[PDB]
Design a protein around this motif. Structure first.
Motif, PDB file in Angstrom:
ATOM      1  N   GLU A   1    -127.587  27.529  70.993  1.00  0.00           N
ATOM      2  CA  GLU A   1    -127.783  27.036  72.351  1.00  0.00           C
ATOM      3  C   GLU A   1    -129.184  26.473  72.569  1.00  0.00           C
ATOM      4  O   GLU A   1    -129.344  25.371  73.114  1.00  0.00           O
ATOM      5  CB  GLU A   1    -127.442  28.120  73.375  1.00  0.00           C
ATOM      6  CG  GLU A   1    -126.185  27.743  74.099  1.00  0.00           C
ATOM      7  CD  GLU A   1    -126.372  26.540  75.038  1.00  0.00           C
ATOM      8  OE1 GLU A   1    -127.429  25.863  75.033  1.00  0.00           O
ATOM      9  OE2 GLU A   1    -125.390  26.192  75.726  1.00  0.00           O
ATOM     10  N   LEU A   2    -130.183  27.113  71.990  1.00  0.00           N
ATOM     11  CA  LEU A   2    -131.542  26.620  72.132  1.00  0.00           C
ATOM     12  C   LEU A   2    -131.706  25.283  71.434  1.00  0.00           C
ATOM     13  O   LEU A   2    -132.408  24.385  71.922  1.00  0.00           O
ATOM     14  CB  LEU A   2    -132.500  27.648  71.534  1.00  0.00           C
ATOM     15  CG  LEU A   2    -134.017  27.499  71.605  1.00  0.00           C
ATOM     16  CD1 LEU A   2    -134.655  28.856  71.849  1.00  0.00           C
ATOM     17  CD2 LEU A   2    -134.478  26.916  70.296  1.00  0.00           C
TER      18      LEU A   2
ATOM     19  N   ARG B   1    -127.040  36.330  67.521  1.00  0.00           N
ATOM     20  CA  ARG B   1    -128.325  35.692  67.350  1.00  0.00           C
ATOM     21  C   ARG B   1    -128.154  34.245  66.971  1.00  0.00           C
ATOM     22  O   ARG B   1    -128.953  33.396  67.382  1.00  0.00           O
ATOM     23  CB  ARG B   1    -129.051  36.351  66.188  1.00  0.00           C
ATOM     24  CG  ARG B   1    -130.548  36.182  66.092  1.00  0.00           C
ATOM     25  CD  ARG B   1    -131.057  37.025  64.939  1.00  0.00           C
ATOM     26  NE  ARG B   1    -132.342  37.623  65.195  1.00  0.00           N
ATOM     27  CZ  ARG B   1    -132.478  38.852  65.665  1.00  0.00           C
ATOM     28  NH1 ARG B   1    -131.385  39.574  65.907  1.00  0.00           N
ATOM     29  NH2 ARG B   1    -133.694  39.356  65.871  1.00  0.00           N
TER      30      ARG B   1
ATOM     31  N   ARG C   1    -125.638  32.369  67.910  1.00  0.00           N
ATOM     32  CA  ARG C   1    -125.177  31.697  69.128  1.00  0.00           C
ATOM     33  C   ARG C   1    -126.351  31.362  70.041  1.00  0.00           C
ATOM     34  O   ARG C   1    -126.426  30.241  70.567  1.00  0.00           O
ATOM     35  CB  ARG C   1    -124.151  32.608  69.842  1.00  0.00           C
ATOM     36  CG  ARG C   1    -123.356  32.074  71.072  1.00  0.00           C
ATOM     37  CD  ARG C   1    -122.375  33.203  71.535  1.00  0.00           C
ATOM     38  NE  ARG C   1    -121.711  33.109  72.849  1.00  0.00           N
ATOM     39  CZ  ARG C   1    -122.100  33.755  73.960  1.00  0.00           C
ATOM     40  NH1 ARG C   1    -123.164  34.571  73.957  1.00  0.00           N
ATOM     41  NH2 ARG C   1    -121.406  33.614  75.086  1.00  0.00           N
ATOM     42  N   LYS C   2    -127.325  32.276  70.161  1.00  0.00           N
ATOM     43  CA  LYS C   2    -128.476  31.999  71.003  1.00  0.00           C
ATOM     44  C   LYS C   2    -129.266  30.860  70.409  1.00  0.00           C
ATOM     45  O   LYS C   2    -129.619  29.909  71.114  1.00  0.00           O
ATOM     46  CB  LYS C   2    -129.331  33.252  71.153  1.00  0.00           C
ATOM     47  CG  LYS C   2    -128.656  34.291  72.033  1.00  0.00           C
ATOM     48  CD  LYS C   2    -129.350  35.640  72.116  1.00  0.00           C
ATOM     49  CE  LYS C   2    -128.563  36.573  73.035  1.00  0.00           C
ATOM     50  NZ  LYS C   2    -129.081  37.973  73.132  1.00  0.00           N
TER      51      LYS C   2
END
Length: 102
Positions: free
Chosen positions: A92-93, A86, A88-89
């Motif tokens: 990236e966002l 979570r 990592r996501k």
């Protein structure tokens, strides 16, 4: 199992092999993994400690009664695995958010 994509960024092919063998076995000692994989036992330990700081591996500690010293049973940490994913996501966002601000 996007677990391997992360371990690869920390320590390459050797790290991906260690997680896959640990995943195949469930639990392993430092020494058990070194025999399975052919990696020096010293290198597996840095991996596991690297994986531990990346919050992808945890352990429970058993006391070896022959020597009086402890040895660790490693496991993939799936308690925090989803949190690591979570983050990592979210990272990236946040990289994309800076672009919208370009």
């Amino acid at each position: 199992t996007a677990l391997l994509d992360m371990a690869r960024d920390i320590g390459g092919d050797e790290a991906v092999e260690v997680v896959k063998a640990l995943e195949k076995k469930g639990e392993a000692t430092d020494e058990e993994l070194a025999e399975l994989t052919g990696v020096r036992v010293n290198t597996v330990r840095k991996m596991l400690y690297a994986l531990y700081d990346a919050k992808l591996a945890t352990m429970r500690r058993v006391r070896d009664d022959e020597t009086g010293w402890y040895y660790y049973y490693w496991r993939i940490d799936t308690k925090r695995l989803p949190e690591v994913i979570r983050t990592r996501k979210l990272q990236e966002l946040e990289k994309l958010k800076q672009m919208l601000q370009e």
